[PDB]
Assembly symmetry: C3
Homo-oligomer: 383 residues x 3
């Protein structure tokens, strides 16, 4: 639907993924932190190409599409919350209920036959772990758990994150995240030197293609993901050679991190443990539009008591945010931006030359293709 | 010729209007004020996508296409007017007569077979009420009166105004103007308060459409327009209610204004009286290109003699320009801008949801669709 | 490929040239001066739409396509030359030899089946007269002499130059260069007044259109060019008239310049003598993309020894560069830019109205159509 049928015929084994330029409809996506939206202070954002309004009313989050039914203006151009449970379009004062999006009044024609006969599109919103998730899909939402990686919703898991807008397609971000050989870009990271990480340049893989990955379609809560197992067998590269001569050493720290790396629909990476043995990184690559994504980064630590919470909160601010989320992952931002041009025309998908460590990326593309809950299209954005 | 055949098939009530992206060929359009162009000071501008040169020679206005027949450069890059009667292209000195566009000389080859055998496109131009009108069309022009609203050209009607370029398609501007319910956006305007206006939130209608408006397809001089008389049987709304409660009130001033509103081909609005009970607003939405229009605003006031004229002039400058043409209509500018996205892919014309107040807009779309003197196309602009 | 057939069928005799938006494959092109690329300091540039990486290894230049075979990133985002003969992609460490582009290693997986089974595109590179030439084409190169004007490579010819990126298609630069009547734009030039150059406004052509130019396809090194001979039989315009009235004079002067003007594939102008009787000007218009070219300007002065070269360089820096290459040719830059709009949509090639001196430009469009060694396409750029 989104990509020239020419290209899609050439990528048979994962064509729906190559079509999914605007992301996957009928999933939950994190868009902002709970503390970023206050009572009666609506925030505007774009998710899967759609402009959305989010309001906190009596502490509960509500989501309306930020496009008036009348002349298609963004309500957020000038917000007019005239009662507590409504928003009034600034233009001809069509008035919508936050609760169901029902056109309930029109201040400029209070007898209009449209009143009570039209519905502004709403999306479910749920807050979990201090994160705002929107279900960008139609009808009754599934449980959040289905669209989160394992352990993110554990009772004791304390989540602290950072969010920013990155100018790459969401898929270049996923494949950067789930890439076993990409750790090459991280070899001079301050995190690797200061936190004395064990980090190879890469992996010479071992065993057959089936041993590289473990596809999880078997999860009780209905998660879809792929674990990378390139190491479980593979020989780590700590001495990078050219013509036999050794030109670069990996890092020989004592701290073992990234034992397990997994990627889950709709596009959330879990790296455990990282950046410390006492932690997990969960990061989403949320589609804003075809060119843009939220890099929604979270660090999880199990905490038992509020003193452990507050110690973690301090360590996040002083150590992990600036050293890991910025000073490790910043290289991941540059990497994603560098792939934009080769995939810009949708032709990257056919002219790329993959090697063995991309077996992981291939399984994710197949997983993504068969188990996605729908392909967002310009039809969803416009019509 | 300008819009996907898919879309035109879905707006059969008024398809030619949806096609008129660049506006209507073979009408008069205001482009600037008489005072803004001095003797032998050529000015360049763009009208219906066409770059044009205007010059005043012995007090009279002449208009050439600003595109040399030879290599297609704008002459306005470096104007060479070497005789009153000619302009010389800066590139290879092809010399055109302002009066008829004839290639009369070539300084770089006075023996050229092209001399006397080529003609640069010219457009009729004339000044009325201190406004420069160009006839952007072919053949002999109609009287200017055909393309001007009633009373604009009256012996005693003093015209004063302001012009600015706005980044919206001209039709968005037309429809904001001729919108009885849009009035809502003006409800906190400094003019409404300080000129004590009786501005309701929304002129709501009353009855069956076929008298929501009067179609003038019958005017002596060939004028084509739509009067909105939504009320006269309908109603003004001063009490804006959500779920039965007054959330907002209109303006409680003495002065009855906007009593009658009319829109005229090729796209000019008359508001009588406005912004005071003794004057009228005439405003044009002149297509520059698909994305841009001149907002050509004028205020009309009957004046007996130059004493009444000079008095209207100081009132205009001290009061009506800042409070009305800026203070009031500045709202109308960012409103048009807010409609750009929904209509940018010509999809807004299929996806819009109208209510009763828009009956007058629909009449305009039909009137415009039936009585325009041609669709400007990219063929007319280039080839 | 590049242009619609509705256009190409209407330019029979030079359709390939109208098609060559990105210029001609299988020719040498200057891109920079030798002094600009130092030992082991690689530089990026775009040529004929393609991103290229040039490096100096043991004094010799090599050129690799600046696009990894793997995920198609530019290597130059972060240059890693680990050994003298290789460059390592910063992402997954695919390692290429400069000499033949062979994938000789991958640091992230030294057992990859890809090693020794993939080639990164190379292009020959050659330095002459302090200028860097890349053979942007396939197979083995002809000698450089084929793609240089006569006398450029002469033993005693001292070359001093200047390079800058100009926002026009390369063909508008060439045509402006070789346009006999474009000298009209230089009538007010400081160089013409202060160096007392004889400069007419243009030429009334002398008789037969087939003696306005000499085509050269029978040269010792396979050079392909046209000479403008309009000055041979032409009558110079020194008194430009409008209606018989002298409105502009040419520049009287003792210095006869531009006795011979010739344009050579792939798009290099030679003007002899210029800007002084003891010097020549060679300028290339090198395609960067559809919209952009290198204006690669050089001045040749036969120098018999080293006081002569130093003396020449003094003159260049103090007078010729600012007065001639800058002062005089800045009007050529503005002239190119002024034609961009008419030719942008490819309609200019059909809509232009040519006159007698354009015989030179038509002869060049035929020469280029006949003797170019390949049309560069998006296929060569993307895949
Ligand atoms: C291998 C090893 C570590 C990581 C990875 C792949 N992908 C990542 C994304 C965020 C943080 C760490 C990692
Ligand atoms: C109703 C009432 C006043 C106005 C209107 C619609 N449209 C307008 C455009 C310009 C100035 C005033 C008005
Ligand atoms: S655009 Fe929202 S009410 Fe008209
Ligand atoms: S472009 Fe105007 S005379 Fe040549
Ligand atoms: S993109 Fe160059 S090695 Fe992967
Ligand atoms: Fe990374
Ligand atoms: Fe208005
Ligand atoms: Fe020139
Ligand atoms: Mg002189």
């Amino acid at each position: 639907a989104n990509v020239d049928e020419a290209i899609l015929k050439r990528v048979k084994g994962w064509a729906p993924y190559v079509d999914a330029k605007l992301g996957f409809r009928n999933h939950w996506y994190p868009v902002m932190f709970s503390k970023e939206i206050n009572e009666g202070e609506p925030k505007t954002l774009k998710l899967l190409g759609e402009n959305l309004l989010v309001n906190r009313i009596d502490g509960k989050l509500y989501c309306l599409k930020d496009r008036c039914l009348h002349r298609g203006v963004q309500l957020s151009v000038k917000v007019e919350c005239k009662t507590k449970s409504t928003i009034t379009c600034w233009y001809h004062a069509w008035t919508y209920r936050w609760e169901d999006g029902v056109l309930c009044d029109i201040l400029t024609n209070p007898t209009s036959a449209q009143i009570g006969r039209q519905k502004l599109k709403t999306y479910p919103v749920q807050e979990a772990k201090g994160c705002v998730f929107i279900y960008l899909g139609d009808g009754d939402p599934p449980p959040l758990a289905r669209d989160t990686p394992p352990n993110f919703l554990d009772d004791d898991m304390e989540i602290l994150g950072k969010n920013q807008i990155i100018k790459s397609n969401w898929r270049l971000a996923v494949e950067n995240g789930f890439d076993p050989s990409h750790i090459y870009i991280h070899k001079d990271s301050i995190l690797v030197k200061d936190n004395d990480l064990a980090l190879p340049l890469g992996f010479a893989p071992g065993g057959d293609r089936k041993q590289q990955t473990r596809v999880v379609d078997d999860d009780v809560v209905g998660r879809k993901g792929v674990y990378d197992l390139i190491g479980e067998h593979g020989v780590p590269v700590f001495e990078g050679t050219i013509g036999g001569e050794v030109v670069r050493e990996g890092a020989y720290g004592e701290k073992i991190v990234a034992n397990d790396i997994s990627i889950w629909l709709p596009g959330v990476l879990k790296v455990n443990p990282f950046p410390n043995p006492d932690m997990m990184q969960f990061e989403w690559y949320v589609p804003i539009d075809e060119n843009t994504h939220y890099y929604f980064q979270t660090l999880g630590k199990p905490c038992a008591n509020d003193e452990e919470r507050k110690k973690y909160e301090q360590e996040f601010e002083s150590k992990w945010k600036p050293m890991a989320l910025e000073g490790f992952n910043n290289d991941d931002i540059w990497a994603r931006e560098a792939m934009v041009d080769f995939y810009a025309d949708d032709k990257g998908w056919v002219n790329e030359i993959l090697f063995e460590s991309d077996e992981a990326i291939v399984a994710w593309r197949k997983l993504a293709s068969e188990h996605n809950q729908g392909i967002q299209t310009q039809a969803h954005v416009s019509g």
